[PDB]
């Protein structure tokens, strides 16, 4: 990375520190991605308007480095920002809809983004909001990294009960709780275990059973122990949204992942009749 300065550090992930940095060669300020030591080599041709744009990939002396376009903000930033009064719903929809559409892309690539959260959504002074840090299906963990509070709150039930092979849905379930945490400004369901995650779910969604979920049963980490709660009034989970916009969210939250409504079908639905595309007001 002689031909890369760095800038100053943004963050460190379980297995890689991120660096603002500024490109010698192009003058370009980047992220660079550092990871202690080929699904990576595709990520480089997945371009979408709403895909953080990984530049290069540079593998030299047991150091693997990712360098991706830098955008000054993330959600989770501009939502505490906006804690106090709340994103307005147009650029809530707009947001929500760039993303589906960027999952549109990948899924019909047959890629899975595998941990979407607030933090790995970036934005822009032009309104954009791009999936960032894709994940994988490596390294060596990094010692200083501080535990995350937010780390399950996204995930999706089916990957908490064990399942090896899970699909695409997977992501429309964790854009769903963001979807819900932008409405709310509350986190969906705020889980600071496994089983506290997949029980605070079951608390508000009922817990599920072959009835609306056929297999969950036979699940890896299924217990038949589990307890029972019923699932409670919707309307109870993000008021004061309408009725198009909880509509579209039960869908994204359907427990059985082939019932969850798909990327391509959701940029259809009616709650998007409306969509714009407003330009956010930041504090950089
Ligand atoms: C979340 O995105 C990533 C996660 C892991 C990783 F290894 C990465 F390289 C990225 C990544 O590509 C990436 C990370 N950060 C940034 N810029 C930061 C600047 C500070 N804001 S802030 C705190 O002011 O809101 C948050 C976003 N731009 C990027 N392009």
Known sequence: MENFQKVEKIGEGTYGVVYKARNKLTGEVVALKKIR???????????????????????????????????????????????????????????????????????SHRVLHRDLKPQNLLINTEGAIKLADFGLAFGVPVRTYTHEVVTLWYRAPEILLGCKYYSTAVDIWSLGCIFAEMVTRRALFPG???????????????????????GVTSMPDYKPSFPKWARQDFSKVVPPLDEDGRSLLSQMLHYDPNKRISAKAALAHPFFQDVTKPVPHLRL
């Open 192 to 214: 600071d275990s496994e089983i506290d995650q997949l029980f605070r779910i079951f608390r508000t969604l009922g817990t599920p059973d072959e009835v609306v979920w056929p």
């Open 37 to 107: 030591l080929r699904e990576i080599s595709l990520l480089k041709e997945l371009n979408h308007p709403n895909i953080v744009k990984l530049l290069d990939v540079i593998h030299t002396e047991n150091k693997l480095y990712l360098v991706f376009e830098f955008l000054h903000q993330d959600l989770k930033k501009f939502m505490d920002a906006s804690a106090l009064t709340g994103i307005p719903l147009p650029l809530i929809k707009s947001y929500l809809f760039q993303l589906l559409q960027g999952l549109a892309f990948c899924h």
